[PDB]
Write an enzyme that holds these catalytic residues in place. Sequence first.
Site, PDB file in Angstrom:
ATOM      1  N   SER A  50       0.803  -1.217   0.000  1.00 33.69           N
ATOM      2  CA  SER A  50       0.000   0.000   0.000  1.00 33.69           C
ATOM      3  C   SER A  50       0.843   1.277   0.000  1.00 33.69           C
ATOM      4  O   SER A  50       0.286   2.355  -0.206  1.00 33.69           O
ATOM      5  CB  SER A  50      -1.002  -0.006   1.148  1.00 33.69           C
ATOM      6  N   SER A  97      -6.337   2.846   3.421  1.00 34.39           N
ATOM      7  CA  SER A  97      -5.663   1.917   2.512  1.00 34.39           C
ATOM      8  C   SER A  97      -6.660   1.132   1.648  1.00 34.39           C
ATOM      9  O   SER A  97      -6.567  -0.093   1.487  1.00 34.39           O
ATOM     10  CB  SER A  97      -4.717   0.982   3.239  1.00 34.39           C
ATOM     11  N   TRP A 190       0.998  -3.373   4.123  1.00 33.22           N
ATOM     12  CA  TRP A 190       0.931  -4.742   4.602  1.00 33.22           C
ATOM     13  C   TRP A 190       0.681  -5.654   3.410  1.00 33.22           C
ATOM     14  O   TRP A 190      -0.443  -5.774   2.954  1.00 33.22           O
ATOM     15  CB  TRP A 190      -0.170  -4.900   5.648  1.00 33.22           C
ATOM     16  N   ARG A 230       2.853  -1.661  13.798  1.00 34.86           N
ATOM     17  CA  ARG A 230       3.743  -0.914  12.925  1.00 34.86           C
ATOM     18  C   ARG A 230       3.900   0.497  13.466  1.00 34.86           C
ATOM     19  O   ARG A 230       5.021   1.001  13.525  1.00 34.86           O
ATOM     20  CB  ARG A 230       3.344  -0.917  11.452  1.00 34.86           C
TER      21      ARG A 230
HETATM   22  C1  LIG Z   1      -1.752  -2.396   1.698  1.00 33.93           C
HETATM   23  O1  LIG Z   1      -0.635  -2.657   2.037  1.00 33.93           O
HETATM   24  C2  LIG Z   1      -2.902  -3.279   2.117  1.00 33.93           C
HETATM   25  C3  LIG Z   1      -3.468  -4.191   1.025  1.00 33.93           C
HETATM   26  C4  LIG Z   1      -2.367  -4.979   0.370  1.00 33.93           C
HETATM   27  O2  LIG Z   1      -4.399  -5.137   1.571  1.00 33.93           O
HETATM   28  C5  LIG Z   1      -3.845  -2.554   3.068  1.00 33.93           C
HETATM   29  C6  LIG Z   1      -4.794  -3.411   3.891  1.00 33.93           C
HETATM   30  C7  LIG Z   1      -4.663  -2.816   5.288  1.00 33.93           C
HETATM   31  S1  LIG Z   1      -5.019  -4.049   6.654  1.00 33.93           S
HETATM   32  C8  LIG Z   1      -6.223  -3.302   7.824  1.00 33.93           C
HETATM   33  C9  LIG Z   1      -6.930  -2.124   7.214  1.00 33.93           C
HETATM   34  N1  LIG Z   1      -7.142  -1.021   8.177  1.00 33.93           N
HETATM   35  C10 LIG Z   1      -6.877   0.188   7.822  1.00 33.93           C
HETATM   36  N2  LIG Z   1      -7.386   1.274   8.452  1.00 33.93           N
HETATM   37  C11 LIG Z   1      -3.304  -2.109   5.228  1.00 33.93           C
HETATM   38  C12 LIG Z   1      -2.502  -1.565   6.122  1.00 33.93           C
HETATM   39  O3  LIG Z   1      -2.729  -1.573   7.355  1.00 33.93           O
HETATM   40  O4  LIG Z   1      -1.506  -1.009   5.616  1.00 33.93           O
HETATM   41  N3  LIG Z   1      -2.899  -1.956   4.019  1.00 33.93           N
END
Ligand SMILES: *C(=O)[C@H]([C@@H](C)O)[C@H]1C[C@@H](SCC/N=C/N)C(C(=O)O)=N1
Length: 244
Positions: A50, A97, A190, A230
């Site tokens: 992300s 995200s 993530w 994180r």
């Molecule tokens: C990007 O890295 C992610 C994608 C690949 O799924 C998103 C998903 C979230 S997990 C929990 C979502 N809550 C957010 N307010 C995430 C992250 O926490 O970075 N990236």
Amino acid sequence: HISSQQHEKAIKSYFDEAQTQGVIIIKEGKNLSTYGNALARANKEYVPASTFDMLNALIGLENHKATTNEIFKWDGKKRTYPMWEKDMTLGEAMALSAVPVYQELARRTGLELMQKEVKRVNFGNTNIGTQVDNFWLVGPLKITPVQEVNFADDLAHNRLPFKLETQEEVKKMLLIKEVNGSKIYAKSGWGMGVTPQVGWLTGWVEQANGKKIPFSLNLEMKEGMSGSIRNEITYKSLENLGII
Ligand SMILES: *C(=O)[C@H]([C@@H](C)O)[C@H]1C[C@@H](SCC/N=C/N)C(C(=O)O)=N1
């Protein structure tokens, strides 16, 4: 006051306590500092996941594929997270995200213009392959913790090759926290569809007096780990070093 041996030990311990392997890179001026319990991760390549949303938004705004107030409508299909089941701006998508919004923005940009913009910016290994809507989630695009902190440093200082206003617009999307006169700007990441799973928090601290201190946390996420680890490691680290 505090020896650097102690700083290094405190920060390693934050990663140790979360039972993960990771590094956090700090940049003061031109000088990089690597902390954590797995220092060698610093020049290893991982999918940006992300964190790519930052560049995706930059490219989209610059190339008029979107504006900062356009509402991306939820298409009514079930999403991995209910918080994604709603209409939102790029900025809201940035905080949540919301992958489907960044996917829609990638599609509007298209493979051709995306590849050129990513090459032009020299982001990571600069390779996006043939699938415009997932190259930052499963590869082949990769980037090192050192490259991420340098990207953040670039954005924090308006040195990327986009207009000033584009950069300012994206930066306002990234404000996540205020702590005693310090503003923290960061993007979390993530990568769930890679083995092993990578966790990111890339950003900078803007101190009261205007100095900007870029950072990039990179660690291994493991099943049944909370996403807020994180943040917690990052805040503890930046506080240990007296940055905030
Ligand atoms: C990007 O890295 C992610 C994608 C690949 O799924 C998103 C998903 C979230 S997990 C929990 C979502 N809550 C957010 N307010 C995430 C992250 O926490 O970075 N990236």
